[PDB]
Symmetry: C3
Subunit: 149 residues, 3 copies
């Protein structure tokens, strides 16, 4: 009875949809996501900002963006080394924007930073220290994505 | 068509259920689960007891309960920091019971503990050296969950 | 109804297929898988070679096989202790092969290794500095599986 089978399959679907959902809530917890909080992740791979921005999307995530002191200390914890942030000023030199829109609300630059130094530095990378410094986007640092609370 | 399509989706639900199962195995493996033995998991987020309880449930698991030494240690290694256990005497002061039910059948308290200190301590937290100590349920300690072997 | 419910369902299914392949991509990512590079996993369990060969197969993976300095160091940083490698000379003493077939094309033995010490040593473990040492396939060591790039 086609009528039946369908309903049965709509059941096998929901159960799976519910399982995979559970599988993911346990995968985040595993990855250290705090309760109802945006949490970061990294494979420790170094690459240009175009590839990181890329990779974070394929994983349905955004390039890491510290919107306060905590999230910054937290991003430092994850990468060890230097890693790009979801911040650039490619649109308007000197005017840093989150890859997700909006102007920086929380910052943490180093003395004389940013500075577009040399041929021009449009990407921001937090360095093993917690402070940030602007650098060439064609450079290559630790890829780090974030995921919604 | 209609009948065939309904068939093509049959094997789909199967191959799925089949992949998700394998995927869940790979995870457990990756999160420490040892062969045939239950396994503990944590985000390290310190919190009150009641939360750890709701949290482990949302994940369809339970607050970590050492049922002997190997387990007590296993929880000790994964937590790396003060953590609650599925054990409390909030029912009958003086008698600790598992959240899953029953009376304590294994312990590893430290000198003079439990002491139902101050106004009262009805919650258990594995502490340094893997020893135990009752502390207020309100206090905040690492949430840890266990999933079946 | 029926026909519409079917097209709607087929969509639901393709959605799950994607959501899962995502779950999978995000996991390998957090497990340090570098882009286009085979990643190595572990539960840290120590066991005999035969037991590892099997554990890796149940996950459809294989015993980690370092073929260059990179992969070695990767694995070495995954084990954190000694672990078997998908390499042995069980068939012809002094002619180490890959469990996946063929003679070795790269090694990183310790000094004066391999030595087939005692009753014999036909297996291999990555030890310190990721250096190699042929051991007894019956000795228990960290199980580490590898999955496709
Ligand atoms: O400690 C070991 C050894 O390290 C250094 O020499 C080796 C080093 O050489 C080449 O790059 C030098 C590079 O090293 C970095 O460790 C760091 O010192 C860099 O310094 C800049 O960046 C930091 C980050 O905040 C700043 O604090 C510092 O002031 C410098 O920034 C200045 O310039 C920026 C733009 O370039 C600008 O944004 C800043 O505002 C500021 O003006 C230092 O430049 C490489 O061979 C390097 O290898 C790695 O990097 C290569 C590309 O850079 C790449 O091709 C390689 O594959 C590899 O990834 C290597 O480490 C030096 O410190 C030496 O004294 C020391 O003994
Ligand atoms: O006997 C254990 C160990 O002892 C020495 O380190 C060497 O003989 C090794 O080849 C051997 O595996
Ligand atoms: Ca510019
Ligand atoms: Ca700039
Ligand atoms: Ca600069
Ligand atoms: Ca009480
Ligand atoms: Ca008490
Ligand atoms: Ca106490
Ligand atoms: Ca032999
Ligand atoms: Ca040998
Ligand atoms: Ca040896």
């Amino acid at each position: 009875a086609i009528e039946v089978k369908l309903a049965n399959m709509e059941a096998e679907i929901n159960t799976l949809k519910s399982k995979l959902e559970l599988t993911n809530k346990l995968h985040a917890f595993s990855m250290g996501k705090k309760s109802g909080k945006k949490f970061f992740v990294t494979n420790h791979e170094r690459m240009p900002f175009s590839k990181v921005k890329a990779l974070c999307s394929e994983l349905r995530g955004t390039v890491a963006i510290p919107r306060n002191a905590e999230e910054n200390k937290a991003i430092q914890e994850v990468a060890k080394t230097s890693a790009f942030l979801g911040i650039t000023d490619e649109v308007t030199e000197g005017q840093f924007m989150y890859v997700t829109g909006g102007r920086l609300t929380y910052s943490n630059w180093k003395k004389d930073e940013p500075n577009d130094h040399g041929s021009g530095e449009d990407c921001v990378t937090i360095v093993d220290n917690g402070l940030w410094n602007d650098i060439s986007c064609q450079a290559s640092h630790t890829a780090v994505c974030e995921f919604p609370a």
